[PDB]
């Protein structure tokens, strides 16, 4: 299936001509779709241990006219087509480029040599073969134009030839044809002529003339609003499609992903009803890592083009990894990733070509550099918003991440004009640094003041590696690939719940092969936790900006202390969860401007939402000290419930979890219930790795409860290593993936499989844990039933027991007990609450 914008120069049966006193050699090379001319694609673009050299091939046009070196080449498309983009590449280097040292020194490789700056370059298009009706796309120097074509008033200056060529668009008033246009800005032409003079000789090597357009005017596109909405009513889950680091340009099959996954495979594993709230993130991973300019650019473009094309045929919306490890074409950039060889003209083209192209993703740049990734991000945010796309920046903030983003003049300007398309999500990879809660505060704060379009989460099972191993145990001396597998599945649900209640709208998980799955199947975590809770979040919109602003009495400004949250919402664990919902996330506005500037911005946002502005406090305010903060916040936000469990009430629904990450302790929540009887109480008691959603009928007679405590036991299969998997960071001979990764894949493929067929193992999820509910004070026994519950795997073992009800006629206390490992939907009916003079008081301690 063809996308609407095509390279007509490649797709059509074109005729190539030159002018009088010119020789034309190898005319086919101009429109063969090849800008790089690589020879060793079959051996990782290496001869032995060395990267193949850059050897430039191209259509040669040579002047045979005495004293006149200027040449031209014309393409006849065979009919008149709406044209939108032209890509010209000529020979880049005067002689042969050599492979030399890049960044970092001794790993990164960069081409070295003298680059050519061509002169008397012009592009003319028209519908007459002699171009007597010619229109100028580009004009530099003083080449003689066709009879009937006037010189422009505005003339371009020479540029240095580049690995990706030059990009031209159809508005001469927009940087003299170099300025990117709105989608569907076209001019009709059959004939395209390129003038060039080589500064040294009478011969120009034309490596590629790409001519991008439509079959007809009916196909010409328009950007009519955003490609997708991201907000409380339109949440988005991102799943990362990592290259397995194996690819050959021209291969028939799709790009192979980690864990025998494919782009079409991952898309087709998503339930149909959630496809409108999902995107796939194409990530180059370590594909051709450290390669010089020609190999890096060729593989960056081929990998993403192939992914985009498969996604286009399947109807999958796509994000591209724009930048990690400061690997950007900008000055000071590294070659840690082939994103170093990004061409902004190509990125623009992918938006024009692929209607399913939506987003650009940035993560983990600042460890390797500050300003280069800010310069790259500024341009890519501008490109995204031009095409109604979006940009996601994922990082943990120690106190200077957002400060550094906004300190870049170009990024600041880009955020002022395009900030509504820009989203900040946390990343708890470094769980050992207690920066999880302040990161959420910074990102919610940025959105609430109106600097960004939203905030969200990336939960990483690498968080487990930094602290824990077996259930209830510390890290020990296990291999880090073992500890990556150790995180409780329900804990991912608790994090989702916490993001949701803070008006988060983006949900992302790593490691992808554990949290989403392998071999184009769904993991236990995905099937029994992520998919179910994300469906809830799609059908029950999160708090809007209006709803969060309404409930916020105080916003902080500046670099909030990591431990500010201890004695308030909870001690930072590195796992993005809370001890209570009483205070929400607590928005902290980073250094987007002075305190006075962010204040104006926040109060003007509140005014737009039609709500009372919050008070702004500097983090250094005397009321926010260790001694004063509890009294200040307790007076602002009334207590909603009593107990050491997490609980929040949002739009009539209760949300709870046990907030212990890896210590085996029960917690309880005591909730005041709706209805005529104000003394009515529910007490919930939960063991760790459990979340719960409760909705009262309102008339006081009934209550629906969904709980989910799904957890696979890894103690024997992963940590004891019962099947003798090789857990190392090393490659085995002839393998292209390290043993640690292979063992994770094999674990997910053989030993931890949902509906495990013959010869594979059901997940180790059959040990049930007790939840107890106490309802007081009642006149008679209530009725409890399981409306729906999690069904057994192929081993036939139950994931829940029938609930047991005990009613004491003397006290009027109903105790309801159930054992689960997974989810159940309970319906409690026949509730008749009477006055309880002993009802737990919903108040703070004296
Ligand atoms: Ca070519
Ligand atoms: Mg605004
Ligand atoms: Mg209700
Ligand atoms: Mg089971």
JSON list of C-alpha atoms in Angstrom, two decimals, residues 142 176 181 222 261 397 412 430 437 453 458 520 724 833:
[
{"chain": "A", "resi": 142, "resn": "UNK", "atom": "CA", "xyz": [24.12, 34.01, -11.70]},
{"chain": "A", "resi": 176, "resn": "UNK", "atom": "CA", "xyz": [14.30, 31.49, -0.87]},
{"chain": "A", "resi": 181, "resn": "UNK", "atom": "CA", "xyz": [6.13, 24.76, 4.04]},
{"chain": "A", "resi": 222, "resn": "UNK", "atom": "CA", "xyz": [-3.90, 19.19, 4.30]},
{"chain": "A", "resi": 261, "resn": "UNK", "atom": "CA", "xyz": [8.96, -9.06, 18.22]},
{"chain": "A", "resi": 397, "resn": "UNK", "atom": "CA", "xyz": [14.84, 15.60, 37.49]},
{"chain": "A", "resi": 412, "resn": "UNK", "atom": "CA", "xyz": [12.85, 28.24, 25.23]},
{"chain": "A", "resi": 430, "resn": "UNK", "atom": "CA", "xyz": [17.72, 5.58, 38.92]},
{"chain": "A", "resi": 437, "resn": "UNK", "atom": "CA", "xyz": [8.16, 12.49, 43.67]},
{"chain": "A", "resi": 453, "resn": "UNK", "atom": "CA", "xyz": [0.50, 20.04, 26.95]},
{"chain": "A", "resi": 458, "resn": "UNK", "atom": "CA", "xyz": [7.84, 5.94, 32.22]},
{"chain": "A", "resi": 520, "resn": "UNK", "atom": "CA", "xyz": [4.42, -11.01, 19.46]},
{"chain": "A", "resi": 724, "resn": "UNK", "atom": "CA", "xyz": [20.43, -22.81, 34.37]},
{"chain": "A", "resi": 833, "resn": "UNK", "atom": "CA", "xyz": [-26.38, 1.04, 57.74]}
]
